[PDB]
Amino acid sequence: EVETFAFQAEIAQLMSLIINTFYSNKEIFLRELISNSSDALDKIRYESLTDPSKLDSGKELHINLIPNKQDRTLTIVDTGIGMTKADLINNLGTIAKSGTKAFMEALQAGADISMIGQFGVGFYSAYLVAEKVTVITKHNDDEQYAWESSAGGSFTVRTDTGEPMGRGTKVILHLKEDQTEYLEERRIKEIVKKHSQFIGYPITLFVEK
Numbered sequence: 001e002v003e004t005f006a007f008q009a010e011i012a013q014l015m016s017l018i019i020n021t022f023y024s025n026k027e028i029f030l031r032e033l034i035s036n037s038s039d040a041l042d043k044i045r046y047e048s049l050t051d052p053s054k055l056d057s058g059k060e061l062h063i064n065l066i067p068n069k070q071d072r073t074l075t076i077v078d079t080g081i082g083m084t085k086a087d088l089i090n091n092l093g094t095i096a097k098s099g100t101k102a103f104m105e106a107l108q109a110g111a112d113i114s115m116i117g118q119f120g121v122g123f124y125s126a127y128l129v130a131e132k133v134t135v136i137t138k139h140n141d142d143e144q145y146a147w148e149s150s151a152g153g154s155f156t157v158r159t160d161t162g163e164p165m166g167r168g169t170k171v172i173l174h175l176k177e178d179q180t181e182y183l184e185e186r187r188i189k190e191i192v193k194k195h196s197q198f199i200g201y202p203i204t205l206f207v208e209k
């Protein structure tokens with residue numbers, strides 16, 4: 001059973017701008033997703049300071065980057081607080097509706113796409129290089145769910161039946177045909193040491209054989 005939702009108009013215009021605007025510094029998407037993972041890890045570690053039972057679903061707090069050249073996917077796995085069905089559907093979009101409006105005002109005032117993180121909408125920068133984004137998350141107070149959208153103005157949410165995660169968020173980027181450079185081991189290295197060198201959690205790059 002899969003439910004299909006319609007993106008808010010402001011968010012839908014933000015993504016379509018991201019995919020269609022000719023912008024060459026697309027490497028900033030990894031900095032935002034890693035920063036999003038660092039925020040999720042800061043939350044779950046902060047809640048465990050007054051409730052250590054929240055870490056029963058996992059004590060390790062790390063970020064994993066798993067490129068796959070066969071499936072043409074780049075995966076970012078973090079063990080943060082996770083996301084609920086209300087967060088995936090509403091809530092998070094309500095928070096981002098103001099950051100989107102302010103972002104589109106700043107692009108016309110001189111700012112570029114690289115400043116998308118300063119508005120709290122840095123996740124949508126994933127569509128700079130991905131034609132389809134799948135999100136698998138697990139929150140301590142909800143079931144495992146699957147978020148998916150190929151832009152177009154709509155997204156789907158369903159209960160995940162795959163391998164359980166315990167807690168955290170898995171972001172799977174189905175990369176575009178011309179963005180396969182972000183699956184190379186030395187390209188992901190350059191981006192991490194240049195953009196996410198000061199993250200307070202271990203960022204492990206999974207190499208392929």
Ligand SMILES: CC1(C)Cc2cccc(C(N)=O)c2O1
Nearest residue numbers: 088092093120121122123135
């Ligand atoms: C930018 C934001 C925090 C809002 C939002 C809504 C739905 C999914 C995500 C995400 N997958 O990071 C998301 O990240």
